Each structure stands twice: as C-alpha cells, then as structure tokens.
C-alpha cells in the first residue's frame, strides 16, 4: 500500500530533503519530476501523473517560510499546495486543526490504498515539536487505528520540559517509533542528516524493490513489536562501505553489524527483544548468510520469553546505482531504552523541582493547575513505559504471581 510522509519543523524538513533526494536518486527521478530510462514501484511514495511526472507525497509543515523555501527550491518537484505555514505551538495547532485535517484528507483521497503514515520530526524542536504533537493526535483521532504511524523522531543531544511533553504524545499515539540521537550520529561520523535519511530510505527497501518476501510494512513492523507498549526501535548502520577495505563478505556484515559503537543511540549490557537485518546487494551468497545467521543467533542475548529468531531480508540494489558494493542496515528492539528514558526523567525532575523557566508557561492559577496536571500525566506515562521495559528483562514477565 501507499505511504504518506509528514515533515514537521526545521530539523524534520532538512532530514526530509535529504531523504527525498536519496529516494529520487534511487528511483532515477529527476529534480523536476521527469523519469529517466519498470520493475520497481515508486508509486508507493510518488504520485504519477498522466503526463509522466513524479511528485512526492510528503506534506511540509513549519513555523517559518525560510526552511520551506530552501527545501522547495532545492527540489522543484514538491507540490506547493502541500506547504503549510511548546504549549503556545500546540495551542496554535488547535487553531489550524481544520486546515491541516483537510490538507491530510486530500493526500489520503489522492492515494488508492493507504498503508501507513511516516513522520519526520524532532522531539527537541520547540514550537514545531508542539505542532507535530498535535498532528499525531488529530491523525490518530480521525483515521482510527486501522492505519499505523511511523515516527522517525530525533532525540535531544528548558529542553527537558519539551522532551517530556512531546514524549507523552509520542508514546500515546505512535505505532512504531524510531529513536535517533545526534550524539551517536556525530560519533559515527567521527551532514548528520545523511545517516538518518539513509536509514529511513533503506528501511522501506523491500517495498519499493519487491522480492520474494516482506512485501508490506505490516510484515516489517510486526516482526519487531511484540507488545504495543514496547514500540521504540534502535537502528544500527554499518559505516564501512565504499572504501577499499570494505567488509569482504556479507557474513562479516552480519557479525560486525551488531557492534554497539555503530548504534544510533547511546548505550552497557542490553537484551534484544527482536531483530531484523537488511542486506542490499546485486548478488548475495546464501551459504554465507546461513552461517552468519547461525552465529548471530548463538551470540546475541535475547530476552527469555521471545522466540529468539533473527530475520535477514535480501534487499535488491537499485538499477540506477552502478555496481556498488554491498551495504546493510540493522534495526533492533533493545531494552537499552531504559537508560535514555531514565536520563530524560532525571533531567526533568532536576529542572521541575527548581522553578527555573516555568514562568514562560504558567500564566495564571488555572494555567498553573493545567500545566501541573499535564506534567504529572506525562511523567507518570514515562515511568510506566520504563517499568514495562524493566519488567520485560526479568524471567517472571509472563507469570501472574
């Protein structure tokens, strides 16, 4: 089925520009939307006119026109009709609810069979994070739960308040949320949006370049989310490619994809809940992959109550990329989320006991009570998810004792 991309905020718009440039390069679509000389299926991400032009399905949302202007000028094939221009931002989103609801309904009507909503946004984006938090609520309300949502939220490197307020709605409404940290991205680079764009583009490779299996997003996601509570994913990318000293075999890709240094978020000891590895090359040797799967299963520490299966998808490289060597992406579901969530909660508590900057949000007695109850609910939800991820680790998870 078709997918709709939502871009919110300055960071979201920049990441989306890189993402769409990568996708258009992979499908050979020119900057003006004209084709270049089919077995691939860009229709899932591009709308095809009866004049042979490809335009992205994405929707651009931002508080200021400079970022949107840069993005549109860089890629002229964006449709201008889809362009629209913390608590203050969220209340502003309430005012524009009708316009945005109709704007999204236009894209849904334009496609034939909708599958999922992609969202590119930054949790630490301030006002834009507020408008994206409202976007999740309105979409989930109007379209129910038949269509799932995927959020490629960028985590932060007064900010604690914003991170908690955005994470409350991220937990409530998102169906499968990727976690990216600028710290680990710049550590890997030792710009940064080119890693997120690459990971997001590769995550959907089996859909755009069909093969024997994994033809739908339901199959890709369902392998990684045993419970709707544990919805945060850790993504790992192998950087050593296109150099002379590349990984010599896909088997070494499978073994060295699990290194903790390549993960896109700060990690000690972790337990894996689910696994799925992407291998993308013109030709793939099966016996190497079998040996690598066996070693990966014998090496990785799974939680007791999970089936303990490692899945390797055999992605196909784009014809428009000339004979490049193998590359691969790893997406995992770990219990390492407790560390980052604990860090966020510690910062939030430290800055909530001290009334440092709450004057910018508490306007009156009723506003004080409103913000206090909202903050308490967000804190309780985050603690609930931490406790759930902690109870997953132990062996008595399925016991009623």
């Amino acid at each position: 089925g078709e997918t709709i991309t939502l871009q919110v905020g300055q960071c979201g718009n920049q990441v989306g520009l890189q993402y769409w440039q990568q996708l258009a390069t992979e499908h050979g679509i020119q900057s003006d939307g004209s084709s270049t000389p089919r077995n691939d299926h860009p229709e899932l991400f591009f709308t095809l006119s009866d004049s042979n032009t490809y335009t992205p399905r994405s929707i651009l949302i931002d508080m200021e026109p400079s970022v949107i202007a840069k993005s549109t000028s860089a890629l002229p094939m964006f449709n201008p009709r889809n362009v629209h221009l913390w608590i203050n931002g969220y209340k502003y989103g309430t005012e524009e609810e009708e316009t945005l609801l109709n704007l999204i309904d236009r894209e849904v009507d334009k496609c034939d069979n909708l599958s999922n909503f992609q969202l590119f946004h930054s949790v630490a984006g301030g006002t834009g994070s507020g408008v994206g938090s409202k976007m999740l609520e309105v979409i989930s309300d109007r379209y129910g739960h038949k269509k799932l949502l995927n959020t490629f939220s960028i985590f932060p490197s007064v900010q604690p308040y914003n991170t908690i307020l955005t994470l409350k709605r991220l937990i409530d409404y998102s169906d499968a949320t990727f976690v990216f940290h600028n710290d680990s991205l710049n550590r890997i680079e030792n710009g940064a949006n080119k890693l997120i764009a690459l990971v997001s583009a590769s995550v959907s490779n089996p859909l755009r370049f069909p093969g024997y299996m994994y033809s739908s997003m339901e199959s890709i996601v369902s392998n990684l989310i045993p419970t709707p509570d544990l919805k945060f994913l850790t993504s790992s990318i192998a950087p050593f490619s296109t150099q002379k000293h590349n990984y010599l075999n896909e088997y070494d890709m499978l073994l060295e994809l699990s290194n903790d240094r390549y993960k896109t978020n700060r990690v000690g000891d972790t337990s894996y809940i689910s696994m799925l590895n992407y291998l993308i090359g013109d030709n793939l040797d099966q016996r190497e992959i079998r040996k690598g799967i066996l070693k990966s299963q014998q090496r990785i520490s799974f939680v007791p109550w999970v089936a303990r299966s490692v899945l390797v998808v055999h992605g196909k490289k784009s014809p428009y990329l000339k004979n490049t060597n193998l590359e691969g992406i790893q997406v995992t579901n770990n219990t390492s989320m407790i560390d980052v969530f604990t860090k966020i909660l510690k910062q939030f508590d430290l800055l909530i006991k001290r009334k440092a900057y709450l004057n910018r949000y508490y306007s009156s007695v009723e506003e004080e009570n409103e913000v206090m109850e909202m903050f308490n609910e967000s804190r309780e939800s985050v603690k609930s998810i931490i406790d759930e991820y902690k109870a997953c680790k132990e062996i008595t998870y399925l016991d009623d004792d």
């Binding site: 099966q286 055999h314 399925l398």
Partner: protein, 344 residues
Amino acid sequence: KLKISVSRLQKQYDDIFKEKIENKVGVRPSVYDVLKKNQKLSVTSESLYKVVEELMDEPTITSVDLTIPLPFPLNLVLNQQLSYQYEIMFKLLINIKFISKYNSSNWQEMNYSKIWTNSHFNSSVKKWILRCRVLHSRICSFIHELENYIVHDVIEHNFEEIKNLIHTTATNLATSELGSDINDEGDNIFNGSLIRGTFNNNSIFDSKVHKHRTTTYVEGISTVEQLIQKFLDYSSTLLNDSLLTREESLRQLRKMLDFIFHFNNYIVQVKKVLVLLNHELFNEYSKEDQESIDKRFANLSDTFLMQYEKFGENLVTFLATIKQVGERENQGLLELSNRLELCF
C-alpha cells in the same frame, strides 16, 4: 469453498495481473505481454492436501489454482509435468502467504484496535492479554522463519544455478551461426566395410560401456533433452526440499497450518468476548453481572491454556520430524532444524 461466488475471484485477479496498455501496429509485443493474457486462475475441487496425497468446507485458499497455457513450441520444453510441479508450489506458497497476511492483520488488531488497546481492564485481563500477545508473536516469528526457509533457502538458491546456466547458453548461441555444413570423403571401402551376414562381435562392447557420467554443464546446455531434464530436476528438488514429499513431514505441516489458521479464527472471535468483560466500552457498544463476568473469564482461561499447550505439542512434534528427515535424506532440512532448535 462453496459459500462464495467463484466467478468473482477470476475478475479480481485479472484486474491485478493481466492489466494492459495497447501498442501501435508494427510495434513488437514483449513475451511477457503475450503470456500475461494466457494465464487463468480458477478454483478447483482438489484441495492441496488431497492432490499432494495422490502423488505421495475448507477455506477457499486451500483450493485456488493457477494455470498458464503456452504457445507452440514453448510448451514442449515447459512440459505439462513441469507446469504441474510448478502449480503445486504455487498452491503451497499462496497458503503460506495468506497465513502471513492473516498473522499481520491479527497483529494490527491485537495491538491497536480500541478493544484490545483499552487501558481500563483489571489486572487479570491485562495479564491474559499480555500472554495472548506474546503467544501470537511466537506464532508470527515461526511462520516468518518457515516462509524464509521455503522461499530463499529452497527456491532462489536452486534457481541461481539455472539462471547462470541459461545465461551462458544464451551467450553461447548468440555467436553461433544457423545451419552447419557436413562433408565426407569418397568412401571407397566397399567390401572392406560391408561386414554382411548376421552381425559382428562388436555388440558386446556397446553394452559393456556405460554413459551415466555427464556433468560440469560445459559451455551451457547443448541438447534440448538436457534442457528439459534440468528443469525437471529443478522442480523435483523444489518438491522434495519442501515438506510435502514424506508422509511424516506433510502430516506435521498440515497439522501446524491448520492449528495456526484456527488460532487466528479464535483470536477474531475473542474480540466479541472482551467487550463484555470491561464496562467502560461495553456501554458504548451496547448502545446499538459479576458472576457472569467471572464465568466468562474462567472460560477464556481454559480455552487459552488449551491453545497454548496445543502449540507446544505441535512445535515439539514438528521439530522432531524435521530433525529425523534432515538427518536421513535432505541436507537443506538439517540446517532448518538447527535454526528452529536454536530459536526455541
């Protein structure tokens, strides 16, 4: 099978597969263009588990078949025996694909449908839901592992050899002229060659020698007989590797697929029951007693435990069967046994 109109499936298949855009006169059609319109998908009375038993209602998926008549002379190489072995694989793969599509949709509801995602259940129902979600995750992982083995470890791996061989043969013939000249001498042997009479004694040598040694597929396929034989061997390999050739493997596979399908149906029927348990949503759905609620939960306890233990039994038997068959005959099944044992 009988509770649905057969003629609708034909049309809903042709809109997907044999759609067309025409081309002007004189523009050559592609071979794919010619073979698209030939294919026909029809429901047959011979179910998969019955048709495969001969060459040792149920849901319609068990009985949907695909046939492709072929032009002359292409049908001589794609002999009917080869197409029949292809059709068996089509039926098996459609069964597994359908179950995977039933495992994904049920996973969408189990996680995000309002009734299942409701937070206002009591502790007991919460733990019951958690157990059910974990069990369904195990079934999903098992089915994806089985499909991965069948499709990548059996079909694509064997097909690589044929693809390479056929490419080599195409390149070999591309540079080869059509028609060969044969020359001969004057053959003055006459009486030195007639050897008239009953016969010579050379007949014993022809029988003494053997010609069972032919390998290395040098310079690609050189005789149409080998061309047909390669594909017949490929189809036989596909059937033998898949868990359809032995009786133990086929029986275990049939039990496993039946159990998974019935579990999905039971999951669907569960959605109705959960409405009555919690109150916060029962009032909303009823718009259109403690003892009774306790009875409902007690019934669900035993039903769910029965499904859980049945899954364990089927898994144990299936692994044992694969292990014995892989150790005896098939190399491909042995590594699958190792992988599944390392899973559970």
